[PDB]
Amino acid sequence: TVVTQESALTTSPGETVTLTCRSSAGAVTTHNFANWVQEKPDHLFTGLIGGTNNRVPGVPARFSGSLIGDKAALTITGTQTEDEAIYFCALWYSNHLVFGGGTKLTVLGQPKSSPSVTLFPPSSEELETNKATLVCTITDFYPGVVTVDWKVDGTPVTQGMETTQPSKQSNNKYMMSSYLTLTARAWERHSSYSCQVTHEGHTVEKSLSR
Amino acid sequence: EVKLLESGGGLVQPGGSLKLSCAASGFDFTRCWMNWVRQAPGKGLEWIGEINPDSSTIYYTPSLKDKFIISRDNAKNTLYLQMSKVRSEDTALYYCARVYYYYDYYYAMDYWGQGTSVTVSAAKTTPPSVYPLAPSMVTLGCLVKGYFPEPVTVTWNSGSLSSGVHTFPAVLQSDLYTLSSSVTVPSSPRPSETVTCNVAHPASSTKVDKKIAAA
Numbered sequence: 001t002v003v004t005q006e007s008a009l010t011t012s013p014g015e016t017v018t019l020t021c022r023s024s025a026g027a028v029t030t031h032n033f034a035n036w037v038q039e040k041p042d043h044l045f046t047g048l049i050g051g052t053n054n055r056v057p058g059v060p061a062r063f064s065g066s067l068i069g070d071k072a073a074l075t076i077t078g079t080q081t082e083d084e085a086i087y088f089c090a091l092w093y094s095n096h097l098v099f100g101g102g103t104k105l106t107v108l109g110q111p112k113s114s115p116s117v118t119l120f121p122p123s124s125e126e127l128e129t130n131k132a133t134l135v136c137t138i139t140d141f142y143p144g145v146v147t148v149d150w151k152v153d154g155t156p157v158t159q160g161m162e163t164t165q166p167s168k169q170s171n172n173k174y175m176m177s178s179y180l181t182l183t184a185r186a187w188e189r190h191s192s193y194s195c196q197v198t199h200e201g202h203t204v205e206k207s208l209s210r
Numbered sequence: 211e212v213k214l215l216e217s218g219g220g221l222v223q224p225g226g227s228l229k230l231s232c233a234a235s236g237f238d239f240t241r242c243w244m245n246w247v248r249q250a251p252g253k254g255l256e257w258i259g260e261i262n263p264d265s266s267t268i269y270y271t272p273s274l275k276d277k278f279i280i281s282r283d284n285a286k287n288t289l290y291l292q293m294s295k296v297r298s299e300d301t302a303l304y305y306c307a308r309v310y311y312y313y314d315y316y317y318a319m320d321y322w323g324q325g326t327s328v329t330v331s332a333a334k335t336t337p338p339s340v341y342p343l344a345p346s347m348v349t350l351g352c353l354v355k356g357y358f359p360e361p362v363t364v365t366w367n368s369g370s371l372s373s374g375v376h377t378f379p380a381v382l383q384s385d386l387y388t389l390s391s392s393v394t395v396p397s398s399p400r401p402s403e404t405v406t407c408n409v410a411h412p413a414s415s416t417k418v419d420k421k422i423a424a425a
């Protein structure tokens with residue numbers, strides 16, 4: 001029923017990384033015919049492994065499939081920068097296939113860059129409609145894992161915000177956007193607004209006051 | 211050139227029904243099992259089912275057997291997916307994939323369709339409200355708020371400012387989509403030369419031009 005993979009793994013090019021694929025229904029065996037699929041930006045999926053350990057022709061030799069203990073494995077050796085991607089495993093159970101949740105593989109192929117953060121206040125035109133949307137643009141960060149917190153008069157906001165999943169810029173860095181949508185009442189009931197972007201332990205704050 | 215061109219997706223009313231097509235090309239469709247898999251907005255991949263070359267065996271994810279009917283017409287090199295009593299949870303990109311029997315030794319989901327989007331919503335065509343985002347270099351932008359359905363297209367100065375432009379993915383909120391587009395420009399030309407974003411929403415047959423000015 002539930003196939004589990006590491007949510008995210010980080011490696012550096014040339015190193016060896018191993019993604020695993022575990023099953024709620026017991027040990028993974030060759031009878032589960034583990035498949036590995038790569039997803040690259042623009043919803044581009046390519047089959048990597050089938051039958052646990054068979055490499056699809058055309059896939060670079062550095063990819064291989066195997067079993068490790070009670071789990072199927074995808075191994076990348078001499079990992080290239082282009083291997084930064086999402087990898088789904090899929091296990092076969094007699095009459096249906098179940099995909100894992102996927103592993104976001106980071107291959108450090110660029111120097112660490114901190115996110116450039118811009119906090120825009122609500123526009124005057126939008127306030128006329130009695131809504132107030134603050135827009136936090138987050139650009140030029142690598143690796144592409146960021147967490148975003150919004151503070152209204154110092155309270156962690158937990159609803160009314162939507163944050164984009166990191167998207168690959170042209171410079172191979174990552175970018176993202178976050179919105180905090182308030183009623184005009186909420187906007188005028190409070191005075192301190194801050195968008196906090198956390199990237200690789202350090203946190204960057206942009207803030208404004210009504 | 212294995213091609214898996216999908217079609218038949220789009221907007222469907224909740225409780226409604228849809229039939230997706232996956233037109234195969236560049237290989238022998240009749241020696242290949244075929245599958246369907248979907249990927250919702252933020253979640254990962256979910257298998258739907260797969261079909262025998264001669265449709266003697268048809269497999270489904272158990273919890274989906276009653277909502278989806280997989281089929282194929284080898285005469286048209288095409289695979290089909292019927293959706294019925296669809297709910298909002300069924301909003302996702304739907305992929306067809308070739309599950310090729312390599313060397314009669316192992317199966318592999320090698321070639322995948324580009325994907326066709328299925329949006330389950332009762333919402334109506336809503337044009338976007340375009341708002342100007344403004345306070346070394348300068349960061350400007352445009353908020354493209356509350357449109358339905360996707361897509362919208364954005365350019366700056368009619369597609370001349372291409373350096374520094376970042377148009378982000380849309381978010382969904384209250385059935386309506388929103389996105390933003392920013393442009394970082396030398397502080398000299400703003401104010402100074404004029405920056406204007408150009409938003410296009412084909413569904414509503416709307417185009418909006420908004421100029422960025424200081425608060």
Ligand SMILES: CN1CCC[C@H]1c1cccnc1
Nearest residue numbers: 033035092097243309317318
């Ligand atoms: C091809 N199907 C029938 C036997 C195995 C199953 C399958 C589905 C997806 C990937 N590999 C195998």
